[PDB]
Design a protein around this ligand. Structure first.
Ligand SMILES: Nc1nc2ccn(CCCCc3csc(C(=O)N[C@@H](CCC(=O)O)C(=O)O)c3F)c2c(=O)[nH]1
Ligand SMILES: Nc1nc2ccn(CCCCc3csc(C(=O)N[C@@H](CCC(=O)O)C(=O)O)c3F)c2c(=O)[nH]1
Ligand SMILES: *Cc1c(COP(=O)(O)O)cnc(C)c1O
Ligand SMILES: *Cc1c(COP(=O)(O)O)cnc(C)c1O
Ligand SMILES: *Cc1c(COP(=O)(O)O)cnc(C)c1O
Ligand SMILES: *Cc1c(COP(=O)(O)O)cnc(C)c1O
Lengths: 456, 458, 456, 458
């Protein structure tokens, strides 16, 4: 045993599962707004020997030796991070060790807030993320709502936009120590300047969580939250198209006559290690670094520009076929479809599209509160990486409308949701039209190229 | 732009760094106890298209669709995890989604405790890990100490062993809710039956953090903590020789007048991992973990684990018979806790001189040095070099390279006082820089001849 | 030394201070809405031998012996408490051991809530009490805001009333586990039914803190919060006219087919003792019992009826002289005067009236946020006990208008507040007119009878 | 209705209860260590018009006006409090507003600690008070245990004394922020210098809760904790013989390179009392406290306190020489901790038979009874009866009344098994009810002859 045997030969059971997944990604129409296809260059670094190095600590301040080159790798990742977002190293630092987006956000709260201090984020059904604090009416669900006291703010249901007015009203009463500007299911641009004004008024930190839009921010195709945010967290995948990891950006420098300094760097870095994490995943850090260099490229500006065009084309196509869009349209990479007008819930449309290899996710619509959410969240980044263009997404909307039509017919043939799901498998004619739509979807999808390796 | 361009063509500056790190890995003698060299099969799955799937939730109960393949990969990783540790799927479940060792522990505390509930772990300078609760005297350092109230139990300074008697005394008073039986710098087996007695008395949870010894437990080579513990957390690297990830083992079924009082661990542990703490699972890490878990079920891994112990005893005996004391005496696992206090050098000086000759170790506070900037000795591990087909004679040669290094360190220390004057000495003085560059050339020539798991060039 | 020597003979220094205070109460016009003059019968029990008995525990479940009669005293106090508020002993229990109003409220939070659980009360400048949670924008001030997380609700400044609408909006977002219905500076009737609806919607306990209005509730001259509240706390003084102590009323009995029981009694009683308090003050409990029997009397119904008439007469007199009243008037025992129209702040009017033996307290007016609050809180219970009637309070308003006029003249003669206060003492003519007003106030006040002892 | 009607005319049913309680107080032998009989002067101020003044805030910094007289009464109570304990007003301040002993402690924790900060007090069954932190094994009982994390230190079971050695060991591990040197059932002096050493080591606050011994400290009759403690809380009754209230003593001035690091206790303590925890002060209690504090400055109180000790030693020696063991051996303060385990009766049975003959004591868990429903012995105190002009011969007579009671209890126990069968026995059996009613008649005749502080009829 050398440890150099191929995965094909060493573990054939796992190799056949890698290939069944690679085929599923190649043949499916991937519309999950948070999914992207990582590049082969980054995957090489992700599955490299850097997994073998323990480098607890930070460059130059490591706890062990032999970190000579992984220090260069981490520092290179930090420089490429600041450059991909046009940041001044005198005004901004970055931590590249958060294992993912959720550990990044928990590190910020741990670094700046005391246990049970107050956090405000967009409510979960309104488009926020779990890590922004989420409690049901019966249970603290997000750990952010266990170690800290979270109170959500809401969309204005009439407009589909964040109710910056009600946020200002509630933040003055709730007195939060940190407010989160960032979304998972939101088709619009967050007014970071209005956020920073509410935060300055109530003496709170503004955290911009730009996981979904980071790739767009790096290409300068949408306004940068760095202009108004004290702290910026992000996933290194999604629109950034790297390996799954996280980043924390923070301010440095100067925040009677004396100059008050920014005090984020030491608290943030301490919260990641020693407080929360252990040994950094240097393989992820390296893969993140390759993607961050890919993001300063002109090809990323045109890809991100295409992501916007493709989402608008998908939105425009959806409106023409008679669909409703939460907040009317989109200014970023995703589209919030409201299917309650057309007579179908998102849960039904989710399963039907899943059976025809169209992966999307149900989404609560404003004024809906469920097991049967009324909407669908459709994303452009994944297919746009596969060189999709506007006409390609208009065809994607065609396949979706076919899928919705199939769901409408099954809805009249069924009572409850489980009757609906059971019908898509046992009924012969429904099974047939699904197979016909699925085959046309996969034939259309396989022709497009796919980032990464060819075999796995 | 296709995204299928090779890393060599796409990012040369990066590619050079992956090669330089591969070279330093190859040329060096890795003796850090937590290190290991991963198999090419696992790194193939680590850098797979599995990174491109969001599968929040759990198999059969996920939030997005299209997770049919990753559902089987997670379920496979679960079954391979139970089989690797000889567990009945009726008495044990496992969560394979923790991102690393530290997240796995935080999930267990979240799952079973309320904030500020009481926790007892081995003190950090006594060989415990940060995640077991480490407050200093001025600062709560570990996040375990902030969101929970942790009091440490100590080693007996006379024996180097865990003072199981003091732990029973201080547990009756501190009334902890969970005690952690796990180490990062401890050369002996842990009396898990004695922990379970103290835990059954104060009505506490017995969590076993076998991260450093996960491989030795799977190979049935040291006693298994699963016979006494309710919850077992582990890392998937170190002795398991996998990708960086974590696991949480928990008992399911019936605990015990009345009826069947059930084990309530599973739903709480799974809920703490998601949605409480983590987001989307790292399916590419879960797959590489599964790969390495299959490798741990095979007879080659038991012979590997048995070779780790022998190289450890060989390292200990070879160190004893050259003028070194070892706290706890010998070693019953994979590492040795050397005490450089009886040779006139400290751990900080020794690892800097050893690192300068491609020999990586780490300081470790020994039972006897209140000065923790100049710690007692070093922590040296076997599992890394053992994976390069090292045997006992190769480790007695490593001890010779080490003793030759500390003696360049004993001479360099006789000519200076403070540690930075020490360090600056090792770089400029031509007579010491030459004698270092010569020992370094001989260790690189010696290590390069051995094989190396993984790819050839990165 | 027998311990039976008179205070007159044993400690003459303290005796001369008792008499200087007795004279100050006899000669002053006491307008502090929370002040009342306790009856002699209760004071006898307050300064009795019951101070000498340790009775930790509860009647029948004491931790020591010899509690044979103090058990009868505590149980008698419980029966008179339930009877004074027309409560069914099958539906209501009462704890008579809270040392005061603040320990009563802290016992409720401790009994029903976990540390850091959420509380909502009327904001402090809006008329709430400290124990309802109060944080400045810099410090947690009330211990209620330290051991639990409080968020306040506000008055509607346009109307001076509680914004029950904004409370419902914020309670749905804040998700409090207990909401407090009760005030210190509020001239209106709290809509307890609307409170109970907000509490039932967000699954919160409704605590009615009726310290200021308890005497009115016992006389059935205003609606009883017991009709809508799960828990009722109160001080045993203020409008109840007893010794300084506290009471916690709670529900008993019944809150698939099974009957869910009320679970307040054991948690409330446990929070008082063993958790929070030590040995009960049986001397206070006994004095509280005499006052509670005085409250079931027809004389208390007419006294409380007179308290309402006197406050309305004081309010009507104030309006006629050109004063503003927060929320336009009053339906209870106090009056919130807004002096910002007449050109004087409450802090100035407070000191000027204090120098003429008219004790009131400054009060923040809605839309004012200070060291110079714009209002004055005037109460009727104290003087109404001294047999004041409507024409007497109209004369009190005359003395106040004279005092305000003196403050207006000093305001033009001075710059800052400290200049104002210093002017009332050093300036000769100002000092004179104050002495003339003070003498007329005290001559008018001394003629009225005074509950309690004659000498101390 | 004037409100000046007498209680006899206004509420006869109440008045009868005040008289019945006055009679039972007069007719009985009060031996509860925390009891005492207040002076008529203090009860005159307790039931004064001072109840009718809201004086939220502090002298010079109040929120209402018209507080000129109560400002001097509070300031007098402060000066009398410092003089009574021989404190320089430059090194000590005092807050006289705590409603009782428990509120005074909670204010100190609030003032100096954050929620869930660590606290160490004597364990409750070992003689500590609830307010020092008492969690059982199923429930946080004291509010000190809910809002703060408390670990108890124990007695040495072999000596009955505070195990100061174990406390130093468990303080280095628990890292407390505040340690409480105070007792409710402990017959020895507390090595406050040894507490200050343990506190100065783990960087903790030394709070002294002298509530049970406040009078003996003021009379310079036992060593004063003010020489070693930073904060001293006390009750104003018990040995101080005042109304029910509390005090918080704190150091002000300069603590200690650089300049004058100031004592920061005062503002935090005062702020915790108001506005944090309490509302309007009980000015009638503050005045009665001041009255009793002046009485404690006088030579009659030192002779009184000295008589308390002698009656305590007389009670201890008289109990020893009749077949009783006393934990800790003797007594150096005001109470005696008897152990009825070596005589075949328990504390629950003895206090029920003694209470039935107008002799009030209390159970106390002795060092040796895990069964705490049938506690070891009784706690008996001197300060109560000493205030009735009791001397040593009168206490040796009380011991005779006690020993005659336990022997009716040893015979009643030989004829039954469980405690309720015990209790029901003492009421129906004509031969035991007669023998109880005879001993009762002799104790009432004996106690009634002694004087009684306070009023004559209520
Ligand atoms: N805008 C936005 N869109 C999306 C789309 C996907 N996500 C993330 C998916 C998780 C969010 C989530 C909401 S509810 C809930 C939960 O309690 N689920 C289990 C608990 C496990 C158990 O009890 O077995 C149950 O109670 O069923 C959750 F986990 C988001 C998001 O975060 N935001
Ligand atoms: N509606 C209503 N009316 C009234 C009228 C009187 N009261 C009660 C009086 C207290 C309320 C209070 C508000 S602010 C504050 C405070 O921080 N005061 C000191 C702190 C001490 C120090 O720092 O020396 C300072 O910061 O100046 C307070 F104490 C009330 C009430 O509770 N409600
Ligand atoms: C290494 C280790 C950890 C942490 O593992 P990470 O992957 O660095 O998070 C936790 N516990 C023990 C016992 C360990 O050895
Ligand atoms: C996806 C996301 C996260 C968390 O990312 P993970 O990798 O799943 O931890 C956090 N915030 C936002 C806005 C996200 O979209
Ligand atoms: C009696 C006592 C207390 C409590 O006094 P209370 O007036 O009942 O609150 C607190 N600590 C000690 C040491 C005591 O003896
Ligand atoms: C006066 C009051 C209190 C507290 O009473 P205290 O005796 O000062 O403790 C609590 N709540 C309200 C509404 C009050 O008016």
């Amino acid at each position: 045993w050398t440890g150099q045997e191929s995965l094909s030969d060493s573990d054939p059971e796992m190799w056949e599962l890698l290939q069944r997944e690679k085929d599923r990604q190649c043949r499916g129409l991937e519309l999950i707004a948070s999914e992207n296809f990582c590049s082969r260059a980054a995957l090489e670094a992700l599955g490299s020997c850097l997994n073998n190095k323990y480098s607890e600590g930070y460059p130059g301040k490591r706890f062990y030796g032999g970190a000579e080159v992984v220090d260069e790798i981490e520092l290179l990742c930090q420089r490429r991070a600041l450059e991909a977002f046009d940041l001044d190293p005198a005004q901004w630092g970055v931590n590249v060790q958060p294992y993912s987006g959720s550990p990044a956000n928990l590190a910020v709260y741990t670094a700046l807030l005391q246990p049970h201090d107050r956090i405000m984020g967009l409510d979960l059904p309104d488009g926020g993320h779990l890590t922004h604090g989420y409690m049901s009416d019966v249970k603290r669900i997000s750990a952010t709502s266990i170690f800290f006291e979270s109170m959500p703010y809401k969309l204005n249901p009439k407009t589909g936009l964040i109710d910056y007015n009600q946020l200002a009203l509630t933040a003055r009463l709730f007195r939060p120590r940190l407010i989160i500007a960032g979304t998972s299911a939101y088709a619009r641009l967050i007014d970071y300047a209005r956020m920073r004004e509410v935060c300055d008024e109530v003496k709170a930190h503004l955290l911009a969580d730009m996981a979904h839009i980071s790739g767009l921010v790096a290409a300068k195709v949408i306004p940068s939250p760095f202009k108004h945010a004290d702290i910026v967290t992000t996933t290194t995948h999604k629109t950034l198209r790297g390996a799954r990891s996280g980043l924390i950006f923070y301010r440095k420098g100067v925040k009677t006559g004396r100059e008050i300094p920014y005090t984020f760097e030491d608290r943030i870095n301490f919260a990641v290690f020693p407080s929360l994490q252990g040994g950094p995943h240097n393989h992820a850090i390296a893969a993140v670094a390759v993607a961050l260099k890919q993001a300063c490229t002109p090809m990323f500006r045109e890809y991100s520009l295409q992501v916007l065009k493709n989402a608008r084309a998908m939105a425009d196509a959806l409106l023409e076929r008679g669909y409703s869009l939460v907040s009317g349209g989109t200014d970023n990479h995703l589209v919030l479809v409201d299917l309650r007008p057309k007579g179908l819930d998102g849960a039904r449309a989710e399963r039907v599209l899943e059976l025809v290899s169209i992966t999307a996710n149900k989404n609560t619509c404003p004024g809906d509160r469920a097991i049967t959410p009324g909407g669908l969240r459709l994303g452009a980044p994944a297919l746009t990486s596969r060189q999709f263009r506007e006409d390609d997404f208009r065809r994607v909307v065609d396949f979706i409308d076919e899928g919705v039509n199939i769901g409408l017919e099954v809805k009249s043939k069924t009572a409850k949701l489980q009757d609906f799901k059971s019908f898509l498998l046992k009924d012969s004619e429904t099974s047939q039209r699904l197979a016909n739509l699925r085959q046309r979807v996969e034939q259309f999808a396989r022709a497009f190229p796919m980032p990464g390796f060819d075999e796995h």
